[PDB]
Amino acid sequence: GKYKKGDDASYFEPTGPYLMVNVTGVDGKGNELLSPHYVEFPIKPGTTLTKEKIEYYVEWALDATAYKEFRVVELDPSAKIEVTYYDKNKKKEETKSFPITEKGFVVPDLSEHIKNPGFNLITKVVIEKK
């Protein structure tokens, strides 16, 4: 490609829990500047993900694009981290949502159901150049 997202990034699917960032970067006046690029970051259950760590993960997800030099200004207040998996026991698909807060929430261990759950972050973020 002309900008192949993935310097070295794993060629095969992740072997453990990961955070998937899919943000759309916008300016203040509501103009879309950057379309969502797929980016993965491994995470560990037991970790606490706060709003500040989320802000830094999205700034790092931009470094994978042409907007590598932008900083996060403001994260959509309604963003949440969602995870979807199939529960072995009940036999249904289930989805958990965690809100992005200052105190934060702890990464759950869903390994009993899936070894590599995908924690999804899909929002808009106002970004500005450094």
**Judged by CB, which is closer to a copy of itself: 31, or 95?**
31
> What residues contact residue 122 under an 8 Å CB cut-off, 6+ apart?
22, 23, 36, 79, 82
Does 106 bind a copy of itself (CB under 8 A)? Our answer is yes
- Could you say which of 11, 31, 78, 92 contacts a copy of itself (CB under 8 A)? 31
Of 55 and 114, CB closest to a copy of itself: 114
Q: Which of 15, 42, 86, 99 binds a copy of itself (CB under 8 A)?
A: 15
Q: Which stretch binds a copy of itself (CB under 8 A): 52-60, 73-81, 108-116, 118-126?
A: 108-116
Please give the full DSSP string across 65-114, using - where no structure is assigned: STTTTEEEEEE-TT-EEEEEEE-TTT-SEEEEEEE--SS-EEPP--TTT-
